[PDB]
Design a protein around this ligand. Structure first.
Ligand SMILES: Nc1ncnc2c1ncn2[C@@H]1O[C@H](COP(=O)(O)OP(=O)(O)OP(=O)(O)O)[C@@H](O)[C@H]1O
Ligand SMILES: [Ca+2]
Lengths: 165, 398, 329, 279, 339
């Protein structure tokens, strides 16, 4: 199931939907916003594509002429890992003010959501952005595992110390 | 409800913690935490308060720099030990009122809210302004006659002394002025003065000795000529003697305290003495702060001048302040009345009984009222809406 | 040209022992000169000068380090040895063939009052034994089951410092067991069978496993050695007595890590076959079919691995390994 | 501090200050302060009748009656004696101190008084220990917290506390710590046995108005004669009385460390993103 | 092969002077900058801050020496040089909502925008004011790229409607009649003379040939499509393995060069014989990028030579680099490239 070719098709699709450009609103006078987010013009919205490596962990990409919204639902092995994932995704969501390539709320039916704007696509390297996504996934996995091990270790130590008294 | 909430004002040089409603702090500790030079309970081995100032196996770190937080995790551990080791009160079964700086960022308030609500699961949380509670503490000098949230508050501490204009509980950021001379700088001035005047003092106890000199014998004078002529002509009743114990040899070391006792406290009235990059006196700073604010509230700001912080507890400080301010004021009034082809400008520098810890006193006085239970953001609202629930604190008590 | 002359002159003056009966300051200056020369100058010149006359200057530096009684000079010599090991593989084999390892061990056991010196000694020993090419039986007389129990106690209990030596001792442990022999002739495994009360080493090894990075591989030389964590885990899970170190929950956690690392690993790599073998050993010596957990997804993953008809030789070897380890019931 | 401190630092420091000021023969200064302690204890120290020569220390607990029902007065009289006096209005247990008549050794009195809550809760534990020592089998439920209840009951001694975990994550962390504490018999073989109950109490506490739920927990501490002895009474009591508080403090600590790790990971990722920009 | 680092942000539009002595550009700002060339180093000379938003389109009438510009400011400015200061004149666009190009006649300009109406505009000397008549027939989306034919009477434009139409913006009050073209005989203001057959991808690129015989366009479906009225308006498309192209221009009568999201200027040739388009390859062969510009190209004009034999190609992109190319050096570099 799990492979590296999944994040290669993910990287490729991310490279394909990183072709955005700045575009003014056709409905509102002198307004400029993300097309993929509001989804007001059906003519500017491309066919959203979903990629699943498994029944639990997948990535949904919804592109536009002036936006690219990538939602990522990470793997959920255990309950603790799920609570930790939720907590970390939330903690990252709070700092959406810093991450101008992420959004404050996750997409419905997904773990986390990042809105890569046309403005964001114009003031940052596309290649580096794709690299950022791939690194985001691999780092998500590795960091989650490390956090799990550390937490378990802490519990073991506290239990041993309390039992030794 | 039945129990009492906890109050904690973290200052640059000293952190004041205790229970609201009490007369004084239940624990007034130092603003420093011990750390290692990492997994498991490695973060549980953290010492805060006075028991961290002189650790040798660990390293003494300072968190609160100039009123603002620099390292969040350290402050988190510090609040942890302040809650469990120093206070030992059930956090889930108690509310909490935290203090903010004058230049506290909104995002910073958000972060504080996150650390207090997510990790501690506090039943109540309220982030207050220092000057807001300060004017309230100053409203505990004057009884019921004039207890208002209008006035100019000057909070001087170990890290930074500031002049902030307060109006009806709402501060005027555009009028707020920052001052360079703080308690640590006066302590340092005393250290240098003592370093140049007499010898026979260990270097490992020099700073503490200087602080002692700033504590016991330090007093502000009226003139810079008489305080020296009285020491030169008499010097038998003025010059005091200080005796300490060298921590190294456990022997009685002695020093002579004199002119420095006047100079250190004089550093505020004249910043030109120890700062080449500062020429403005405190009188001018307060004058400009009162003038650069709204004109309609200017009289009120000049009327309620409240002293807050430890660096303002020095003797006859507010006297000289009010003297210079009223002097310049009467001068400008005369100049305006000489070319007038004006009413008496009333000015008063208030000296509160708890002017040393006014920021915490005002908080204890606010948290004791029933309104503090209505004003404080609930844990429910915090979990339902988000951190933005702690972003705007209501002002009541008027 | 000047660097080679300074190094040769330093090596000649140090081999005169005339250096042991000289001033500490001058010796410090000479050692600092040699170290700075080996650190800032060309690699080829330092390699030729060190290996000159069949590692004459190196052997001389080793003997002088064995005769010296100064702590600081020992630290500088350890650093210079680290640089010389970072220079090439030949100098590493030469130093590993010398008694420098044994002396480093004895000094590590004797002088416990020197934290930095012990750290530099542990690091230098870790670098010297990071190849695991030659194994002298004489070196086993100074570093064996006793030293193994000592290091294991250093990891489990720890000393009274920055505590940055625990991970260094763990690294030295992983490096030493990299050149170990099978579960029957392994000293480390014997010590592990002796005192299985060590839970901390398991947690640390677990963190090291989940990290994915190798703490032993610092230099990049041709014919790189195998993975330390995998071999150590194999030697530990090679027998029930040695696999007894893992706790009730820790075993399941390690099973989760091995399964996840096995499933994430794409076909064609090298680590996948090794992790598969470790998974085979963990179900061979350890009670895997006891709580029967984590075996479902493992079964699905194994089935997806055996249906992988890759033309490459690596995936074929991996498939052969899983077919060898297919004890299904 | 890994383990929770048993003595109240506020009362200890205040009493130490008062005693140090009094030993110097200095003027008697008035004192008034309201403090609190874990499990919702309410302390209040003040000078009675405006007399600076007298210092009263009051303590109030919600389950003071249940504690007095198990012979708290006798233990309090044994511990304090002359110091123990008529309880203040509204308080549960009040002690008195006269500045005009004091002893030389101050450390003992301060260390004893600082453990007020511990000595107040130690009554039932001492009674049960003596009962187990006597061998009179076939013989308690104290509501220490508002939504919690501690239940204490031939060869062993069982102490099952039924506490509540409000936060959803705190239940998970507490479950991990309990899961580690149950098999904690691997570290020290001489240690007591540890059992854990997730949603329903143990067989002993069954249909005894047992509060069951997903947010509740019943931790069973099984001690033996080795730990229930009079020789190791004070320490074991000091730990057991602070079991819950230590658990919650440890879980919260885990939450904090998690916060730190999250901040760090956020820094690394944000660094990658900052490294993804042009300049 | 001459890339010049001017700014860090992206570029909007690229314009040149008559004798190609000065170059004008906008940096996604409320103002437009005009720089000249004095030696090896370039220096800015003029600055116009009339617009009230991000500038989208800008074109300079060479013979007239007069540059018109229109962007998000929902307005047009027909700037002309007044002494030592470029005076701007607000030409009312009359649109409730991204493209501008002067005609070969240099008398009237087309302003294609998001108002779904190619707003042609001529200058009325009778009222001393610019008037803008809007051609909106058969238009469903914004006008990405607009390019004229040699006739200076028929305009071509690609839309977000997945098609590149060639309509007529001929105002019979500003010029004489139009001769018969191979693209049709009936040429009226608003009359649709040609259109595309694509139902996918946005037509970001569109440019007509020098002979006026063929009109090509680049679609955002990773596909380029050139049409020839010489063979009964035959349409020849081709799918590029590379990403979508953003700008398209013809170098020769049968050889066109174009770039885009591929971030690398590519060359292509279309054989009139078989009647199909062919790919020449990568003319730009050598951060971490394998090309000059570190982002997608945004515009590609001609420096000198015409659309039949360009001697120098000017390329502006989202990389903040001015890419000056030469056909001679490109032909001397890639020996496997047939123009
Ligand atoms: N008895 C005293 N009289 C006058 N000044 C004092 C006395 N004791 C201490 N100080 C000075 O007051 C300073 C601390 O004042 P204060 O407590 O108001 O600041 P803080 O609250 O710790 O920090 P911040 O003002 O940034 O919040 C110290 O630097 C010290 O030098
Ligand atoms: Ca303060």
């Amino acid at each position: 199931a799990t492979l590296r070719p999944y994040l290669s098709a993910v990287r490729a699709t991310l490279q394909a939907a990183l072709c955005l450009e700045n575009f003014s609103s056709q409905v509102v006078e002198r307004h400029n916003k993300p097309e993929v987010e509001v989804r007001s013009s059906k003519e500017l919205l491309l066919q959203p594509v979903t990629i699943s490596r498994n029944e639990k962990e997948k990535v949904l990409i919804e592109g536009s002429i002036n936006s690219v919204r990538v939602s990522i639902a990470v793997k959920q092995a255990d309950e603790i890992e799920k609570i930790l994932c939720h907590k970390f995704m939330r903690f990252m969501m709070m700092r959406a003010e810093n991450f101008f390539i992420l959004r404050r709320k996750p997409v419905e039916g997904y773990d986390i959501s990042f809105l890569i704007t046309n403005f964001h696509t114009e003031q940052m390297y596309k290649h580096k952005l794709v690299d950022f996504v791939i690194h985001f996934m691999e780092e998500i996995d590795k960091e989650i595992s490390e956090m799990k091990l550390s937490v378990n270790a802490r519990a073991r130590i506290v239990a041993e110390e309390f039992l030794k008294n | 409800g039945r129990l009492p909430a906890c109050v904690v004002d973290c200052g640059t040089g000293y952190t004041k913690l205790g229970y609201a409603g009490n007369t004084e702090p239940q624990f007034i500790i130092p603003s420093c935490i011990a750390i290692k030079e990492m997994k498991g309970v490695d973060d549980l081995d953290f010492f805060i308060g006075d028991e961290a100032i002189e650790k040798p196996t660990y390293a003494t770190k300072w968190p609160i720099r100039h009123g603002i937080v620099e390292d969040w995790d350290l402050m988190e551990r510090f609040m942890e030990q302040v809650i469990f080791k120093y206070l030992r009160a059930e956090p889930e079964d108690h509310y909490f009122l935290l203090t903010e700086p004058p230049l506290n960022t909104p995002e910073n308030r958000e972060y504080t809210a996150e650390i207090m609500f997510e990790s501690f699961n506090v039943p109540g949380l309220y982030i207050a302004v220092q000057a807001v509670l300060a004017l309230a503490a100053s409203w505990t000098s004057r009884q019921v006659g004039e207890r208002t949230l209008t006035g100019t508050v000057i909070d001087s501490g170990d890290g930074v002394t500031h002049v902030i204009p307060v109006a009806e509980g709402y501060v005027i950021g555009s009028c707020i002025k920052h001052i360079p001379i703080a308690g640590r700088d006066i302590t340092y001035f005393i250290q240098q003065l003592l370093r140049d005047r007499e010898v026979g003092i260990p270097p490992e106890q020099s700073l503490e000795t200087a602080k002692a000199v700033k504590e016991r014998y330090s007093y502000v004078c009226p003139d810079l000529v008489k305080e020296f002529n009285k020491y030169d002509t008499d010097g038998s009743k003025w010059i005091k003697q200080y005796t300490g114990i060298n921590a190294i040899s456990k022997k009685e070391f002695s020093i002579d305290v004199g002119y420095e006792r006047f100079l250190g406290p004089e550093i505020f009235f004249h910043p030109e003495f120890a700062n080449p990059d500062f020429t403005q006196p405190i009188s001018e700073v307060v004058d400009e702060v009162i003038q650069n604010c709204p004109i309609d509230v200017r009289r009120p700001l000049y009327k309620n001048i409240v002293l807050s912080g430890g660096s303002t507890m020095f003797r006859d400080f507010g006297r000289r302040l009010q003297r210079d301010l009223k002097r310049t004021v009467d001068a400008r009034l005369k100049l305006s009345e000489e070319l007038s082809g004006p009413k008496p400008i009333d000015v008063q520098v208030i000296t509160h009984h708890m002017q040393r810890y006014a920021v915490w006193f005002g908080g204890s006085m606010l948290a004791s009222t029933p309104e503090f239970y209505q004003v404080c953001h609930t844990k429910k609202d915090y979990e339902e809406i988000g951190p933005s629930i702690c972003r705007h604190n209501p002002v009541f008590g008027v | 040209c000047h660097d080679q002359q300074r190094l040769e002159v330093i090596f000649a003056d140090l081999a005169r022992s005339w250096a042991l009966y000289e001033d500490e300051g001058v010796i410090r200056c000479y050692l600092e000169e040699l170290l700075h020369i080996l650190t800032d100058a060309d690699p080829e010149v330092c390699k030729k000068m060190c290996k000159r006359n069949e590692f004459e200057s190196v052997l001389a530096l080793v003997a002088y380090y064995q005769m010296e009684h100064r702590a600081s000079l020992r630290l500088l010599l350890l650093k210079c040895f680290g640089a010389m090991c970072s220079l090439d593989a030949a100098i590493i084999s030469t130093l590993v063939s010398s008694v420098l390892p044994v002396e480093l061990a004895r000094d590590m056991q004797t002088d416990t009052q020197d934290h930095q010196k012990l750290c530099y000694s542990a690091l230098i020993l870790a670098m010297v034994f990071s190849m695991g090419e030659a194994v002298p039986y004489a070196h086993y007389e100074h570093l064996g089951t006793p030293f193994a129990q000592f290091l294991l106690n250093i990891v489990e209990d720890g000393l009274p410092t920055t505590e940055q030596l625990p991970d260094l001792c763990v690294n030295l442990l992983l490096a030493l067991n990299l050149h170990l022999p099978a579960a029957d002739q392994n000293v480390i495994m014997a010590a592990l069978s002796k005192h299985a009360n060590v839970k901390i080493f398991s947690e640390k090894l677990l963190l090291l496993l989940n990290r994915g990075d190798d703490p032993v591989r610092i230099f990049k030389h041709e014919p790189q050695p195998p993975h330390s964590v995998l071999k150590f885990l194999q030697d530990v899970f090679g027998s029930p007595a040695t696999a007894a170190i893992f706790y009730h929950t820790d075993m399941m956690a390690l099973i989760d890590i091995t399964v996840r690392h096995i499933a994430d690993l794409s076909p064609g790599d090298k680590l996948r076959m090794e992790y598969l073998s470790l998974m085979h050993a963990i179900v061979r010596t350890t009670p895997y079919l006891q709580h029967r957990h984590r075996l479902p997804d493992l079964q699905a993953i194994l089935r997806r691995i055996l249906n992988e008809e890759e033309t490459s030789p690596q995936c074929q070897m991996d498939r052969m390994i899983v077919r060898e380890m297919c004890k299904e019931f | 501090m890994i383990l929770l401190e048993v003595n109240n630092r506020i009362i200890e420091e205040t009493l130490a200050l008062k005693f140090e000021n009094a030993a110097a023969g200095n003027k008697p200064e008035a004192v008034e302060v309201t403090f609190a302690d874990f499990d919702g204890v309410l302390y209040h120290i003040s000078n009675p009748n405006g007399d600076k020569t007298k210092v009263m220390v009051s303590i109030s607990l919600k389950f003071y009656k249940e504690l007095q029902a198990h012979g708290a007065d006798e233990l309090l009289k044994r511990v304090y004696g002359s110091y123990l006096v008529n309880p203040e209005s509204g308080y549960n247990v009040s002690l008195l101190y006269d500045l005009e008549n004091l002893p030389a050794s101050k450390d003992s009195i301060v260390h004893q008084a600082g453990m007020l809550k511990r000595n107040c809760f130690a009554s039932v534990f001492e009674k049960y220990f003596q009962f187990q020592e006597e061998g009179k089998e076939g013989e308690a439920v104290i509501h220490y917290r508002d939504d919690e209840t501690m239940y204490v009951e031939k060869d062993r001694v069982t102490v099952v506390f039924s506490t509540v975990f409000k936060d959803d994550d705190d239940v998970v962390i507490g479950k991990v710590f309990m899961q580690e504490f149950k098999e904690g018999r691997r570290a020290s073989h001489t240690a007591p046995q540890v059992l854990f109950s997730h949603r329903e109490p143990p067989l002993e506490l069954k249909d005894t108005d047992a509060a069951v739920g997903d947010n509740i927990g019943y931790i069973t501490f099984v001690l033996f004669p080795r730990h229930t002895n009079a020789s190791a009474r004070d320490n074991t009591i000091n730990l057991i009385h602070t079991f819950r508080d230590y658990l919650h403090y440890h879980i919260k600590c885990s939450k904090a460390y998690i916060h730190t790790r999250m901040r760090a990971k956020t820094s690394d990722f944000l660094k990658v993103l900052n490294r993804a920009r042009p300049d | 092969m001459a890339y010049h680092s001017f700014l860090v942000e992206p570029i909007s539009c690229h314009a040149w002077n008559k004798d190609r002595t000065q170059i004008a550009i906008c940096p996604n700002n409320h103002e437009v900058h005009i720089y000249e060339k004095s030696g090896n180093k370039w220096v800015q000379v003029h600055e116009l801050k009339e617009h009230n938003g991000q500038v989208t389109g800008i074109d300079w009438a060479p013979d007239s020496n007069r540059i018109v510009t229109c962007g998000t400011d929902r307005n047009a400015y027909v700037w002309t040089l007044k002494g030592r200061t470029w005076k701007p004149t607000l030409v009312i666009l009359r649109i409730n909502r991204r493209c501008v190009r002067w005609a070969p006649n240099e008398k009237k300009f087309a302003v294609g925008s998001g108002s779904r109406v190619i707003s042609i505009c001529y200058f009325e000397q009778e009222n001393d004011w610019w008037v803008c008549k809007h051609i909106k027939k058969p238009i469903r989306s914004t006008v990405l790229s607009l390019d004229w034919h040699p006739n200076s009477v028929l305009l071509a434009a690609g839309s977000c409607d997945f098609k590149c139409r060639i309509f007529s913006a001929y105002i019979k009050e500003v010029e004489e009649r139009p001769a018969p073209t191979p693209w049709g005989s009936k040429m009226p203001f608003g009359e649709l003379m040609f259109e595309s057959s694509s139902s996918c991808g946005w037509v970001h690129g569109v440019c007509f040939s020098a002979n006026g015989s063929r009109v090509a366009w680049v679609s955002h479906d990773s596909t380029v499509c050139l049409a020839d009225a010489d063979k009964k308006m035959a349409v020849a498309t081709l799918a590029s393995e590379t990403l979508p192209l953003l700008a398209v221009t013809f170098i020769t009568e049968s050889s066109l060069v174009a770039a885009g999201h591929d971030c690398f200027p590519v060359l292509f040739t279309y054989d009139s014989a078989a009647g199909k388009l062919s790919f020449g390859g990568r003319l730009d062969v050598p951060a971490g990028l394998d090309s000059l510009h570190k982002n997608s190209v945004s515009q590609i004009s001609v420096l000198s030579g015409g659309k039949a034999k360009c001697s120098q190609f000017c390329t502006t992109g989202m990389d903040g680099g001015m890419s000056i190319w030469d056909v001679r050096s490109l032909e001397s570099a890639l020996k496997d490239l047939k123009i």
